[PDB]
């Protein structure tokens, strides 16, 4: 009779990743009469013909083309058998393909937002993306990941549609740009990830003013100073960017000695270098109060004020004046009967400067009769040091020198003519 298969249908359950040529199964037919047995496909299917290879003699079924679960999951194959002339025996072969997580998730970004205002309202849609995975089961479910520390809340809009919203108010002065990476994680083991990142640039509002490094300033200038002298350097900082962060310096206008402030001090608008336009004579005025403003470009401008206090330092640049005596007989008198210590005269002198530069000391330089008189060091009193004698001359002359105590010191000289009275 006809041959007999060991089973009218053969089953197998294999994974889709089975290498080509791997033996799938083996079909057996036997003749019961007492040989040569043919094994051939029955109704050849083009997909089944490409995907499965069997020879007649071995009767083994091996893989000819890679099986993709995503293409087809079940195969119904018709097989028969010949003994030569006799009736062809029929038998089915059923191949169950299993799913292997061999497709990482594919993320398609539908909408996006590439810029956001600093003081913007939270809740703006940053991105609306959808993820699709070709695999099946838990190998096909997908989760969307965003860095944890970054303060935003991501939620799923509907089904596999997700939204990326702003949970925390944004401020440009913290970080400039963003490289936000959403990583798609597969649930099937081992998991397969596919990450996609989006770029962003933060809009910058002019909401911060320029701030000075010190709440108040104070500089010092010598009395005489060159034209265009470098007095100070001022610097203010603006945490913004672009036009909204440039600094421009100005000197608020006041009046000194009836003259505008622009007469003595200028500032460079770009570099806070304070320049002195004239020399500040200490005996004319000692100090001036200034106000420095710093603004930014763009609209509207945003500025700040700082209180500068400029002080001129005195310099010994004035010789003492001897107001007494001047060129009334220039001759002072002294009695012949004058006791020791008689106040003959007293030198009067002043000094335009201040402090040690206005500290006068008078000393005796030259005397017609040496031990007769005495000049008070700090009072300038010309007095008698001894009693007068008949030998002493009728007309006397002293040379007094007035010194200031500055650095370096300056002196003056005066000759006193003192007549001896009788
Ligand atoms: C965002 O950052 C990632 C890094 O986390 C960047 O990825 C780099 O890409 C270059 C170019 O192909 C690779 O050579 C590096 O290996 C990647 N860095 C890694 C893996 O850490 C990505 O290009 C950035 N994109 C934007 C828009 O900023
Ligand atoms: C600067 O002037 C503004 C108003 O013009 C004022 O609000 C501010 O207090 C002033 N600066 C200082 C340090 O007082
Ligand atoms: C010019 O130079 C002086 C030093 O001589 C600085 O102190 C000033 O700030 C400016 O830079
Ligand atoms: C601001 O910039 C000036 C330059 O003009 C410096 O001299 C100052 O010390 C501050 O850094
Ligand atoms: C008065 O005295 C001072 C200091 O002794 C001198 O520097 C000056 O020239 C004048 O003679
Ligand atoms: C006082 O005396 C001195 C002498 O050294 C002169 O140099 C000066 O001009 C003043 O007459
Ligand atoms: C007064 O006269 C004397 C001369 O003894 C000078 O030395 C002095 O400088 C001042 O002219
Ligand atoms: C007496 O004479 C002297 C010059 O010898 C003067 O310096 C003095 O002021 C007074 O006239
Ligand atoms: Ca596959
Ligand atoms: Ca698969
Ligand atoms: Ca997958
Ligand atoms: Ca801000
Ligand atoms: Ca800003
Ligand atoms: Ca600003
Ligand atoms: Ca002077
Ligand atoms: Ca002076
Ligand atoms: Ca002086």
Resolution in A: 2.6
- Which atom of ligand 4 is nearest the CA belonging to 273? 5
67/21 Cα distance (integer angstroms)? 12
Q: Which CATH number fits domain 211-312: 3.90.550.10, 1.10.10.410, 2.60.110.10, 2.60.40.60?
A: 2.60.40.60
- CATH class assigned to 4-98: mainly beta
- How crowded is residue 212: how many other Cβ atoms within 10 Å of its Cβ? 18
378/403 Cα distance (integer angstroms)? 10
Distance 174 CA to ligand 10 centre (A): 45
- Strand order through the sheet with 23-26: 23-26, 60-63, 52-54
| Residue ranges of the chain assigned to CATH 2.60.40.60 | 4-98, 106-202, 211-312, 321-420
Q: How far is CA 345 from CA 322, 390, 398, in A?
A: 14, 21, 11
The residue nearest atom 11 of ligand 7, judged by CA position, is 415
CB-ligand 3 contact for 233 (6 Å cutoff): yes
The ligand minimizing its distance to the Cα of 204 is 13
388/136 Cα distance (integer angstroms)? 136
Token pair belonging to 32:
């019961």
For ligand 8, pick from 325, 414, 416, 417 the residue to mutate: most ligand atoms within 8 Å of CB: 417
18 secondary structure, DSSP code: P
The ligand minimizing its distance to the Cα of 182 is 1
Distance 292 CA to ligand 14 centre (A): 17
The ligand minimizing its distance to the Cα of 192 is 11
Question: How far, in whole angstroms, is CA 71 from its chain's centroid?
Answer: 56
Topology at the third CATH level for domain 106-202? Immunoglobulin-like (2.60.40)
Q: After which residues is the chain broken (C to N over 2.5 A)?
A: 34, 327
3-state secondary structure at position 138: helix
Residue 133: CB partners within 8 Å, gap ≥ 6? Answer: 103, 104, 105, 106, 139, 140, 141, 142, 186
For ligand 7, pick from 415, 416, 417, 418 the residue to mutate: most ligand atoms within 8 Å of CB: 415
Query: Are 301 and 295 in contact, with CB atoms under 8 Å apart?
Result: yes
305/301 Cα distance (integer angstroms)? 13
Q: Is the peptide bond before 190 cis (omega within 30 degrees of 0)?
A: yes
Residue 158: CB partners within 8 Å, gap ≥ 6? Answer: none
Looking at 91-177, list the stretches that DSSP marks H as alpha helix, in order from N- to C-terminal side: none
CA angle 189, 195, 198 (to 5 degrees): 160
- How crowded is residue 422: how many other Cβ atoms within 10 Å of its Cβ? 7
133/386 Cα distance (integer angstroms)? 125
3-state secondary structure at position 40: strand
286/89 Cα distance (integer angstroms)? 126
The residue nearest atom 2 of ligand 4, judged by CA position, is 235
177/204 Cα distance (integer angstroms)? 11
- Which atom of ligand 8 is nearest the CA belonging to 414? 7
Token pair belonging to 304:
């700040």
Q: Domain 321-420 is of which CATH architecture?
A: Sandwich (2.60)
- CA-CA-CA-CA dihedral for 134, 135, 139, 142, to nearest 10: 10
């Amino acid at each position: 009779n006809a041959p007999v298969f060991t089973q009218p249908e053969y089953h197998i359950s294999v994974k889709e990743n089975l290498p080509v040529g791997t033996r799938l199964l083996t079909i057996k037919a036997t003749d019961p009469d007492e040989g040569e047995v043919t094994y051939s496909f029955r109704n050849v299917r083009e997909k089944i013909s490409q995907l499965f290879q069997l020879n007649s003699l071995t009767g083994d079924i091996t893989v000819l083309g890679e099986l993709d679960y995503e293409d087809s999951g079940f195969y119904d194959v018709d097989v028969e058998a010949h003994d030569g002339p006799g009736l062809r025996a029929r038998s089915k072969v059923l191949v169950t393909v299993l799913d292997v997580n061999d497709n990482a998730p594919e993320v398609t970004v539908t909408s996006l937002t590439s810029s956001i205002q600093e003081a913007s309202s939270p809740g703006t849609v940053i991105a609306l993306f959808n993820v699709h995975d070709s695999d099946s089961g838990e190998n096909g479910l997908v989760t969307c990941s965003i860095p944890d520390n970054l303060p935003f809340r991501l939620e799923k809009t509907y089904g596999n549609y997700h939204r990326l919203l702003i949970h925390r108010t944004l401020d440009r002065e913290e970080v400039s740009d963003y490289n936000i990476t959403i990583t798609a994680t597969d649930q099937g083991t081992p998991p397969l990830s596919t990450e996609t990142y989006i770029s962003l640039q933060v809009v910058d509002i002019n909401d911060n003013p320029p701030t000075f490094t010190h709440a108040s300033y104070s500089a010092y200038i010598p009395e005489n100073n060159p034209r265009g002298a470098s007095i100070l350097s001022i610097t203010a900082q603006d945490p913004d960017s672009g036009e909204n962060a440039q600094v421009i310096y100005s000197l608020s206008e006041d009046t000194i000695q009836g003259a505008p402030m622009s007469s003595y001090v200028s500032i460079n608008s770009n570099t806070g270098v304070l320049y002195a336009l004239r020399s500040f004579d200490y005996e004319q005025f000692q100090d001036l109060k200034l106000l420095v403003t710093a603004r930014d470009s763009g609209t509207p401008p945003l500025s700040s004020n700082v209180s500068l206090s400029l002080s001129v330092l005195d310099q010994n640049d004035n010789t003492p004046e001897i107001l007494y005596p001047t060129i009334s007989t220039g001759v002072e008198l002294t009695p012949r009967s004058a006791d020791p210590g008689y106040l003959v005269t007293k030198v009067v002198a002043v000094d335009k400067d201040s402090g040690q530069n206005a500290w006068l000391s008078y000393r005796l330089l030259k005397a017609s009769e040496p031990g007769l008189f005495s000049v008070g060091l700090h009072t300038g009193e010309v007095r008698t040091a001894r009693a007068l004698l008949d030998r002493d001359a009728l007309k006397q002359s002293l040379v007094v020198t007035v010194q200031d105590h500055g650095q370096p010191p300056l002196s003056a000289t005066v000759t006193l003519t003192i007549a001896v009275s009788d």
